[PDB]
Amino acid sequence: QLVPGARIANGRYRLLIFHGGVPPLQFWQALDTALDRQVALTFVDPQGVLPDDVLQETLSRTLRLSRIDKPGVARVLDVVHTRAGGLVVAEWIRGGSLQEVADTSPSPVGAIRAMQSLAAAADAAHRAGVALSIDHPSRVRVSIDGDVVLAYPATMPDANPQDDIRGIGASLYALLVNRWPLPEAGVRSGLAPAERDTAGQPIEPADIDRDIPFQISAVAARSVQGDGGIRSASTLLNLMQQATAVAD
Template identity: 40%
Template sequence: MPGALFAAGRYRLLERCDATSDTGFWHAHDLATGQDVALTVVDFAGRGPDAAAAVADCFAGTVWLGRVRSAALAPILDMVVVESAAVVVSEWLPSRTLAEVAAGGPSAAGAAAALLPLARGVQGAHRRPERVVSLDNPNRIRVGMDGTAYLAFPGLHPSATRQEDVRVLGAAYDELTAGTGCSGASSADLVVRTLEYIVAQAEVAAARAEALDAEAVSAAGPDQGGSEVNVRLFVAISVVALVFLGALGWFVGTSLV
């Protein structure tokens, strides 16, 4: 429960960010270091005598993730065993959930650009034999304050599959945009190509709009600007003349009294 101490009193649980059937994702505070951390708690209690082997498999797969240096992956700080659970401790970064970002109504191109680094990371992992990222839940993903989506709760589940990685990437994009741009993608390569295409199309549209604006300014030419100055000058001279004539009339009128 939030507020409880965990792992022999090392961490204070602050908020449960989500959970699957056997995995919890927590925002916690490390009482030893004074920093906030993310905890991925994979509980193998249901494995009985095989729990220890499952914990070892989880850690073995997570070791590889810990060596990845990418803005799309929260740095892994530690891995600890708590009874029959494998706990992966990673750095907590200032960030927002996908739902919070989606509430702001991001554009399709903005959502695609945010997810591209993570999608490319998954693509790179899948190009290695037997590597998966274990994206079994969209809420493993958060969006940093720089706008980059990243794996906030790393930790390899022994049953993770590449198909699940791809499915959740597509689900994350659809949640951000309330669309179906990546749903049904069959591979990380296809997700990356789709996101790149969305970003490229937006860049082309922006470049085209900028070119049209430049053409409009060029067509107007410098004479338009000069005409505006001339009109303003004429109005100013007219006002001064009227004031002067009014003052002169007042002076003459008072002199005749």
């Protein structure tokens, strides 16, 4: 039974705050009662609803992400089986979620500037044969050092890179215009859905607000599109650097 105040993993972690998740996953912020440090717990499968075969695959792909010493990805501290199935324990990222920051109407330059860290991450992960699983606004947070970060790691097996880019776009989008360009699916993200044009395709961030520079809007848009505009975290990074440089 997972709720604030609950002690977890032989009571090492007192649950603090629930930050959402895509089932079967749960993103929690909790306290390391052993070290009086804070952490991001990701309960892989709390309801043990997964084929215990599968849960292995997830946990194994995820552990690969621990390799990566990027700023894009919150560092994985420990992995374990608890009363509540699989559980990833990564570092706590000081700052606020995606929701939280989207909601402060940030500079479209700052936005795409920050977001670079997370394409950096996602590219490295990719070059290393592993997706970030950018699937829900909740997964992401922004650090007081001005970095976008996969805060709750757990690469699912269905997870792929094409979708990491798509989802990374949705993250840029959501900062610029404060909306989720994707369907969502799980915890009400906190982010209100994107306005679908007469076509159904979400509406470009600049068409929605003229102070959002050309490229910066363009980047975010082509990203999400499944056509799609961009085909590598690699290039997508330089796109961000382009768009960003221009405003500079």
